[PDB]
Design an enzyme around this catalytic site. Structure first.
Site, mmCIF file in Angstrom:
data_model
loop_
_atom_site.group_PDB
_atom_site.id
_atom_site.type_symbol
_atom_site.label_atom_id
_atom_site.label_comp_id
_atom_site.label_asym_id
_atom_site.label_seq_id
_atom_site.Cartn_x
_atom_site.Cartn_y
_atom_site.Cartn_z
ATOM 1 N N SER A 243 0.820 -1.194 0.000
ATOM 2 C CA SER A 243 0.000 0.000 0.000
ATOM 3 C C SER A 243 0.864 1.258 0.000
ATOM 4 O O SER A 243 0.552 2.233 -0.676
ATOM 5 C CB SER A 243 -0.916 0.000 1.225
ATOM 6 O OG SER A 243 -1.852 -1.057 1.145
ATOM 7 N N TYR A 246 1.753 3.022 -3.090
ATOM 8 C CA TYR A 246 0.712 3.844 -3.704
ATOM 9 C C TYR A 246 0.646 5.264 -3.161
ATOM 10 O O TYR A 246 -0.211 6.039 -3.569
ATOM 11 C CB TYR A 246 -0.648 3.171 -3.569
ATOM 12 C CG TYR A 246 -0.800 1.976 -4.470
ATOM 13 C CD1 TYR A 246 -1.111 2.133 -5.819
ATOM 14 C CD2 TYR A 246 -0.620 0.684 -3.981
ATOM 15 C CE1 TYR A 246 -1.237 1.027 -6.667
ATOM 16 C CE2 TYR A 246 -0.743 -0.426 -4.813
ATOM 17 C CZ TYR A 246 -1.052 -0.248 -6.155
ATOM 18 O OH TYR A 246 -1.174 -1.344 -6.977
ATOM 19 N N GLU A 327 -4.451 -9.014 -2.124
ATOM 20 C CA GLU A 327 -5.192 -7.808 -2.454
ATOM 21 C C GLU A 327 -6.618 -8.067 -1.994
ATOM 22 O O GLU A 327 -7.103 -9.189 -2.113
ATOM 23 C CB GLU A 327 -5.180 -7.574 -3.960
ATOM 24 C CG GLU A 327 -4.118 -6.622 -4.410
ATOM 25 C CD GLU A 327 -4.078 -6.454 -5.911
ATOM 26 O OE1 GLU A 327 -5.147 -6.212 -6.515
ATOM 27 O OE2 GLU A 327 -2.967 -6.556 -6.480
HETATM 28 C C1 LIG Z 1 -3.753 4.281 -8.254
HETATM 29 O O1 LIG Z 1 -4.775 3.698 -9.050
HETATM 30 C C2 LIG Z 1 -5.119 2.325 -8.878
HETATM 31 C C3 LIG Z 1 -5.816 1.681 -9.918
HETATM 32 C C4 LIG Z 1 -6.149 0.325 -9.829
HETATM 33 C C5 LIG Z 1 -5.777 -0.387 -8.676
HETATM 34 C C6 LIG Z 1 -5.086 0.241 -7.621
HETATM 35 C C7 LIG Z 1 -4.727 -0.510 -6.356
HETATM 36 N N1 LIG Z 1 -4.508 0.121 -5.163
HETATM 37 C C8 LIG Z 1 -4.196 -0.793 -4.214
HETATM 38 C C9 LIG Z 1 -3.887 -0.664 -2.843
HETATM 39 C C10 LIG Z 1 -3.897 0.632 -2.196
HETATM 40 N N2 LIG Z 1 -4.218 1.744 -2.878
HETATM 41 O O2 LIG Z 1 -3.614 0.733 -1.007
HETATM 42 C C11 LIG Z 1 -3.593 -1.817 -2.092
HETATM 43 C C12 LIG Z 1 -3.618 -3.067 -2.719
HETATM 44 C C13 LIG Z 1 -3.929 -3.194 -4.083
HETATM 45 C C14 LIG Z 1 -4.221 -2.066 -4.843
HETATM 46 N N3 LIG Z 1 -4.547 -1.866 -6.147
HETATM 47 C C15 LIG Z 1 -4.754 1.606 -7.730
#
Ligand SMILES: COc1cccc(-c2nc3c(C(N)=O)cccc3[nH]2)c1
Length: 350
Positions: A243, A246, A327
């Protein structure tokens, strides 16, 4: 001045930072001279999604080359881009189109933050920090460092850092307990479900005024399902490092923000590979992408009746999947109850 506690004051300032909003747009290659922060519109973003939806169809279904060019020109005219002394790439491959759908997900939150920041500053008696704070409609409290909650959360961060994600270290600077207005009531019916876990959710600092005021949201109906692996839902992880990636931090900007939310998973629909899911099969409440590694099940604890998978990164044995780490995806906005906001310090190693 501000009645708020020091850490909360510094959280508000970081969240509503205008320079960060612009830095984000520049990274997305948007032309700030032709489209400044003030020009951003909700309906503008909504239309851009529909354009991306059509061009995505045309590419995958073998559309005319003239249609894709037309859609490309309409997209860039709607959202001015700055590609330098470089030729503007056409929206003709699914990966570039995907990159653009995500730019829009961020713009939807940036637009909210700028709109909040801009209006309602007519008090004087109240400090600007306090005023912006109230705009979030979220009660925020600092969690005690030598608390039981804090200890459990630090253990979760330390033990769940992924092996392949060691391009940096992680330090918990501050932990905040957050309660969005009316969210606990919205989530009330899901307290009836079993398998409720405390999971991670990372995002850019520029997305937080929108996350706090609107809550975690699912991509708009106009958006292409292709731009999201397991369909349009809310994604979470059990490894803090998955996470944390991201948050989109750097050595030039090492402070990230991450959420801990109680998510009602119920009976999970376990998948080994991607699937642009539209709706849950009878008896399913969530999706679980199986990873090759996940926390030590023996170490799993509880925090207010919610499971906290804080064990050490162990090999699952389900080593025949696409994903390296799990996930979790929910397709109902009401299936999530945000609990903590952590301010992290990414110590990039050399
Ligand atoms: C940033 O745009 C996207 C698009 C598609 C999927 C994702 C996406 N975000 C996450 C997170 C998280 N944000 O914490 C955690 C686990 C799997 C993930 N997949 C993000």
């Amino acid at each position: 001045k501000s009645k708020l506690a020091k850490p909360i004051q510094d959280l508000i300032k970081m969240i509503f930072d205008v320079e960060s909003m612009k830095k984000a747009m520049v990274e997305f290659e948007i032309d700030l001279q032709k489209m400044p922060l003030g020009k951003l519109s909700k309906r503008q973003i909504q239309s851009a999604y529909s354009i991306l939806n059509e061009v995505q169809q045309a590419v995958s279904d073998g559309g005319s080359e003239s249609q894709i060019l037309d859609l490309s020109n309409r997209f860039y005219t709607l959202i001015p881009h700055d590609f330098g002394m470089k030729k503007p790439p056409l929206l003709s491959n699914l990966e570039y189109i995907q990159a653009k759908v995500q730019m829009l997900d961020n713009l939807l939150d940036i637009e909210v933050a700028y709109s909040l920041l801009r209006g309602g500053n007519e008090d004087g008696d109240k400090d600007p920090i306090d005023i912006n704070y109230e705009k979030l409609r979220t009660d925020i409290k600092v969690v005690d460092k030598d608390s039981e909650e804090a200890k459990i959360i630090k253990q979760y961060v330390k033990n769940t850092h992924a092996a392949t994600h060691n391009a940096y270290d992680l330090k918990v600077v501050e932990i905040f307990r957050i309660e969005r207005e009316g969210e606990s009531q919205r989530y009330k019916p899901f307290k009836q479900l079993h398998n409720r876990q405390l999971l991670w959710h990372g995002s850019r600092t520029t997305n937080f005024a929108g996350i706090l005021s609107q809550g975690l949201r699912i991509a708009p109906p106009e958006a292409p399902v292709t731009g999201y692996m397991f369909g349009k839902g809310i994604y979470f992880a059990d490894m803090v490092s998955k996470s944390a990636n991201y948050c989109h931090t750097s050595q030039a900007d090492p402070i990230g923000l991450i959420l801990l939310g109680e998510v009602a998973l119920g009976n999970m629909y376990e998948l080994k590979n991607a699937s642009h899911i539209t709706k849950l099969p009878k008896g399913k409440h969530s999706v679980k992408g199986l990873g090759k590694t996940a926390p030590d099940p023996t170490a799993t604890t509880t925090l207010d009746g919610v499971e906290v998978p804080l064990g050490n990164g162990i090999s699952t044995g389900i080593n025949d999947t696409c994903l390296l780490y799990n996930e979790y995806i929910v397709y109902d906005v009401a299936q999530v109850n945000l609990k903590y906001l952590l301010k992290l310090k990414f110590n990039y190693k050399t």
